[PDB]
Amino acid sequence: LRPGRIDRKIEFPPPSVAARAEILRIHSRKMNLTRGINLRKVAEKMNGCSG
Amino acid sequence: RVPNYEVSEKAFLLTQSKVSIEQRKEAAEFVLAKIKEEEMAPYYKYLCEEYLVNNGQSDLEHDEKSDSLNEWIKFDQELYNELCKKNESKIKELNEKIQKLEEDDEGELEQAQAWINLGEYYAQIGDKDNAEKTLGKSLSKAISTGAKIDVMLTIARLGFFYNDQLYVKEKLEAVNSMIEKGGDWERRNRYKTYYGIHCLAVRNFKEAAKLLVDSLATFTSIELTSYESIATYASVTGLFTLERTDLKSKVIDSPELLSLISTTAALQSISSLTISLYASDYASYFPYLLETYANVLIPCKYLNRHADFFVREMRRKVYAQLLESYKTLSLKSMASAFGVSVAFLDNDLGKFIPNKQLNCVIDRVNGIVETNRPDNKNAQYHLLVKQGDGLLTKLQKYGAAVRLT
Amino acid sequence: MSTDVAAAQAQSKIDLTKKKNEEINKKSLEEDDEFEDFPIDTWANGETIKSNAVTQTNIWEENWDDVEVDDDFTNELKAELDRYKRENQ
Numbered sequence: 349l350r351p352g353r354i355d356r357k358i359e360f361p362p363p364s365v366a367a368r369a370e371i372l373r374i375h376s377r378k379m380n381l382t383r384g385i386n387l388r389k390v391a392e393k394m395n396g397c398s399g
Numbered sequence: 400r401v402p403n404y405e406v407s408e409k410a411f412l413l414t415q416s417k418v419s420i421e422q423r424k425e426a427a428e429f430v431l432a433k434i435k436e437e438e439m440a441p442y443y444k445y446l447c448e449e450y451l452v453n454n455g456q457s458d459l460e461h462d463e464k465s466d467s468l469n470e471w472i473k474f475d476q477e478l479y480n481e482l483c484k485k486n487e488s489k490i491k492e493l494n495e496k497i498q499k500l501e502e503d504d505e506g507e508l509e510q511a512q513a514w515i516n517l518g519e520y521y522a523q524i525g526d527k528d529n530a531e532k533t534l535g536k537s538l539s540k541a542i543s544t545g546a547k548i549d550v551m552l553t554i555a556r557l558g559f560f561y562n563d564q565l566y567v568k569e570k571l572e573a574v575n576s577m578i579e580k581g582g583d584w585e586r587r588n589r590y591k592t593y594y595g596i597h598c599l600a601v602r603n604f605k606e607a608a609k610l611l612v613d614s615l616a617t618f619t620s621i622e623l624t625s626y627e628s629i630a631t632y633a634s635v636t637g638l639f640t641l642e643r644t645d646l647k648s649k650v651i652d653s654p655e656l657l658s659l660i661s662t663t664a665a666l667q668s669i670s671s672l673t674i675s676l677y678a679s680d681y682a683s684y685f686p687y688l689l690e691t692y693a694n695v696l697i698p699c700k701y702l703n704r705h706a707d708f709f710v711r712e713m714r715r716k717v718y719a720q721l722l723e724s725y726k727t728l729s730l731k732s733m734a735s736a737f738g739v740s741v742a743f744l745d746n747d748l749g750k751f752i753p754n755k756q757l758n759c760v761i762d763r764v765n766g767i768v769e770t771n772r773p774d775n776k777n778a779q780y781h782l783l784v785k786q787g788d789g790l791l792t793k794l795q796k797y798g799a800a801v802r803l804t
Numbered sequence: 805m806s807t808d809v810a811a812a813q814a815q816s817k818i819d820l821t822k823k824k825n826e827e828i829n830k831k832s833l834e835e836d837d838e839f840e841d842f843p844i845d846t847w848a849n850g851e852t853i854k855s856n857a858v859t860q861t862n863i864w865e866e867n868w869d870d871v872e873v874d875d876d877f878t879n880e881l882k883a884e885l886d887r888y889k890r891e892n893q
Contacts, residue, residue, distance in 0.1 A: 377545060377585050382616050383626070414855070452852050462853075564863055601864040685883055692876060704858060707869045710876055738890070743882035750871075803822070 427471040438485040442525030544581030592618040608640040615655035634669040681736040
């Protein structure tokens with residue numbers, strides 16, 4: 349963790365509701381849906397904590 | 400995006416002499432307004448050419464003559480100001496911005512995407528050639544499979560917009576290979592709805608139908624016509640292709656159709672024609688037919704040209720279904736049920752006998768209609784010799800050319 | 805109008821001396837000109853310019869609907885003509 353050893357420390361939070369909708373759409377690009385399914389509402393319902 | 404399909408529907412009606420004056424000019428206002436607004440002014444040069452001696456034909460780039468009823472063909476200096484104004488601002492901005500994305504140091508994210516950005520502007524204004532060139536550059540360089548299919552759909556749409564089918568035809572055949580490479584069930588669905596439309600333009604309802612049932616459940620509209628429109632299109636294809644029981648499953652008991660109801664003039668009439676075929680109602684079959692010609696086939700941009708083929712087929716279908724069920728009928732009996740006269744019936748029947756769908760002789764002495772059935776093993780025999788004869792032609796002609804070499 | 809290299813395009817056909825023979829000899833029956841003689845004389849039909857090419861030489865397959873030129877007006881008139889008698893009985 350000392351400098352001159354490393355050069356970068358990237359931090360990742362878990363998803364936000366906006367971030368969530370994107371992550372969900374990637375998994376959805378590979379399977380079926382039906383009209384009238386809002387990816388937004390499933391982001392709200394999901395409390396999640398992992399992608 | 401969304402503006403491109405909706406303008407072209409209305410513009411096609413401007414060409415038609417089959418729609419009422421009222422309707423034609425309801426459309427003509429919508430056209431002119433959204434071309435001036437969104438800068439579809441390069442396409443407007445095409446469209447004057449397309450109206451030209453049907454209705455529209457007084458122009459400041461084509462034929463001078465007073466048999467025009469349309470003023471929405473005619474140029475304006477207001478239109479010419481609009482062209483120039485919008486073109487110069489947007490273009491100027493977008494060329495210098497794009498160039499820098501490709502300039503700076505990154506060729507897999509930024510350079511690929513910038514070419515999409517040129518492509519949106521060409522696709523917006525309806526210049527086909529220069530949209531095909533830019534978007535070629537994106538495809539050529541290496542990117543996601545999903546993006547590769549998606550970009551390619553836009554090019555296909557430009558053909559659909561111009562009302563030129565050979566252009567579409569070239570595009571979706573290429574896309575079709577890339578579908579299993581991405582493994583995307585989402586963009587297989589979006590592929591299906593596109594292919595639906597391509598099959599629809601040319602005469603081939605058989606493939607149209609398989610895809611159109613699929614397009615009711617799933618599609619999210621991406622430069623394609625409403626789901627009201629697609630629902631209507633599914634109904635029409637449904638009657639043509641499928642027998643009584645499959646008509647029942649796929650159309651009538653469709654959760655999709657049931658849940659969209661009848662909210663437009665064209666859907667209202669078509670759903671009525673499906674039910675009456677199924678119910679062995681015959682009185683209301685001929686009235687419903689006249690209404691679907693006016694209000695479904697004509698306002699289409701794909702079944703306005705297949706109108707003649709379609710109306711001839713359903714007429715043949717209804718007569719067929721009654722005969723298939725009945726060994727004997729009277730001309731008077733059959734004619735009461737349909738609501739036409741006896742004389743009017745006899746004509747339409749005797750027209751369709753040599754076309755071998757109806758399979759019935761008709762006596763004039765007693766007025767009985769006997770129903771023969773020579774189709775069976777004998778039927779399959781005529782088909783085989785005929786297709787085999789053709790195959791033989793192919794074998795000799797390809798063969799002889801090569802043997803010479 | 806050429807695409808790629810000319811190597812692929814020499815590999816997909818080299819013109820035959822046999823074809824040279826066929827073409828000129830046939831031309832004796834074709835008179836002085838009979839390649840463009842008929843569409844020169846008839847002026848390619850005496851009709852409106854329009855914008856479709858699905859009347860003759862359609863892209864889609866030819867199905868017979870040349871029989872009736874419009875059987876939709878006809879079916880309308882037939883239905884309406886019975887309509888009267890029926891109703892007024």
